[PDB]
Amino acid sequence: YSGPKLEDGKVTISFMKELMQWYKDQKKLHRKCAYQILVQVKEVLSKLSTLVETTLKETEKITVCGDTHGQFYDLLNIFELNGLPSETNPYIFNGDFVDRGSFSVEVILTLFGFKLLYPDHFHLLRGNHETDNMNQIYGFEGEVKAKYTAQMYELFSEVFEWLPLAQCINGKVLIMHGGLFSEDGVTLDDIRKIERNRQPPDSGPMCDLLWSDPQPQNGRSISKRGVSCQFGPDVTKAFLEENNLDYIIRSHEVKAEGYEVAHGGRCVTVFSAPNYCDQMGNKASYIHLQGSDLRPQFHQFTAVPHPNV
């Protein structure tokens, strides 16, 4: 019998290497492990706010990634080639982990495991696809039900209800996926004073926070959904000047070349989603930021075909 083992409540390197080989054997972990890992991430995250002040020195390097959509095999290849993860090499992913992903649940649970390994060195921000509105109706709920039972589903939902929105790094970098409201007067405090462990909203400006994205052209383009629309470049430039940001590199916008410098050249969009839905097969890349190299560092990797499982 190869039953579970907890060691001092601490997830150790040998143990999740054993877990990686177990998942290469493609079996199912016993439900009590799910119980303790879920409760532990529950207390460790529930104490974490939307904005937590974390300072990273010029001697520390940080790894950030684009839209991956649960490429678990590519993550294993990263662990294999890029070296063992370190306290001085935090990894951050720019949302969009789920939907169109058939085993992103294993990805997210091993991410919670790594959070147990590094509770103050792995941080993520809520994406716009991690919402029950589209997950319940458009097949992701069916995927969850095929995988597991409804009680664990509501457990993951209530865990996700505390997901943060915005981060500040180095006092020079501001991190978010969606963006801003359509109107001026946006502070960090108003979002901070909004209690987020409640019923998720359907739409509106709070939905604009994670879905409204700027456009490379100027002006104000009406949203094709018929509700609200993407706010103009005057707001963006005013906020750029006020919040002392130079530029940001993000994703969730389709580029033929896999990257582009747009918005009058003031923003960088990178496509690190290789062959999403088996369509583009574009190059992927992840970015290292550190004090010793002021320009962002780019590592470009490519994906491989995966078994039809």
From Swiss-Prot:
A GO CC term assigned to this protein in UniProt: intracellular membrane-bounded organelle
Catalytic activity, reaction form: O-phospho-L-seryl-[protein] + H2O = L-seryl-[protein] + phosphate; O-phospho-L-threonyl-[protein] + H2O = L-threonyl-[protein] + phosphate
Binding site for substrate: 69, 100, 128-129, 225, 252
Location(s) in or outside the cell: Nucleus; Cytoplasm; Cell membrane
Post-translational modification: Activated by at least two different proteolytic cleavages producing a 56 kDa and a 50 kDa form.
Coiled-coil intervals: none
Tissue expression profile of the protein: Ubiquitous.
Keyword set, alphabetical order: Acetylation, Alzheimer disease, Amyloid, Amyloidosis, Cell membrane, Cytoplasm, DNA damage, DNA repair, Hydrolase, Lipid-binding, Magnesium, Manganese, Membrane, Metal-binding, Neurodegeneration, Nucleus, Protein phosphatase, Repeat, TPR repeat
Regulation: Autoinhibited. In the autoinhibited state, the TPR domain interacts with the catalytic region and prevents substrate access to the catalytic pocket. Allosterically activated by various polyunsaturated fatty acids, free long-chain fatty-acids and long-chain fatty acyl-CoA esters, arachidonic acid being the most effective activator. HSP90A and probably RAC1, GNA12 and GNA13 can also release the autoinhibition by the TPR repeat. Activation by RAC1, GNA12 and GNA13 is synergistic with the one produced by fatty acids binding. Inhibited by okadaic acid.
The keyword Hydrolase is annotated on this UniProt entry: yes
UniProt: Mn(2+) 1 binding residues: 67, 69, 96
Active site: 129
Example of a GO MF term: Hsp90 protein binding
EC class: hydrolase
Catalytic activity, EC: 3.1.3.16
GO terms, biological process: cellular response to cadmium ion; cellular response to hydrogen peroxide; DNA-templated transcription; double-strand break repair; MAPK cascade; mitotic cell cycle; negative regulation of apoptotic process; negative regulation of MAPK cascade
Chain segments carrying region Catalytic: 9-309
Keyword Kinase belongs to the record: no
Residues where Mn(2+) 2 binds: 96, 128, 177, 252
Cofactor (UniProt): Mg(2+); Mn(2+)
Subunit structure: Probably forms a complex composed of chaperones HSP90 and HSP70, co-chaperones STIP1/HOP, CDC37, PPP5C, PTGES3/p23, TSC1 and client protein TSC2. Probably forms a complex composed of chaperones HSP90 and HSP70, co-chaperones CDC37, PPP5C, TSC1 and client protein TSC2, CDK4, AKT, RAF1 and NR3C1; this complex does not contain co-chaperones STIP1/HOP and PTGES3/p23. Part of a complex with HSP90/HSP90AA1 and steroid receptors. Interacts (via TPR repeats) with HSP90AA1 (via TPR repeat-binding motif) or HSPA1A/HSPA1B; the interaction is direct and activates the phosphatase activity.
Family statement drawn from the similarity comment of this UniProt entry: Belongs to the PPP phosphatase family. PP-5 (PP-T) subfamily.
Physiological role: Serine/threonine-protein phosphatase that dephosphorylates a myriad of proteins involved in different signaling pathways including the kinases CSNK1E, ASK1/MAP3K5, PRKDC and RAF1, the nuclear receptors NR3C1, PPARG, ESR1 and ESR2, SMAD proteins and TAU/MAPT. Implicated in wide ranging cellular processes, including apoptosis, differentiation, DNA damage response, cell survival, regulation of ion channels or circadian rhythms, in response to steroid and thyroid hormones, calcium, fatty acids, TGF-beta as well as oxidative and genotoxic stresses.
Protein name: Serine/threonine-protein phosphatase 5
Species assigned in the record: Homo sapiens
Boundaries of the shown chain within the full protein: 176 to 484 of 499
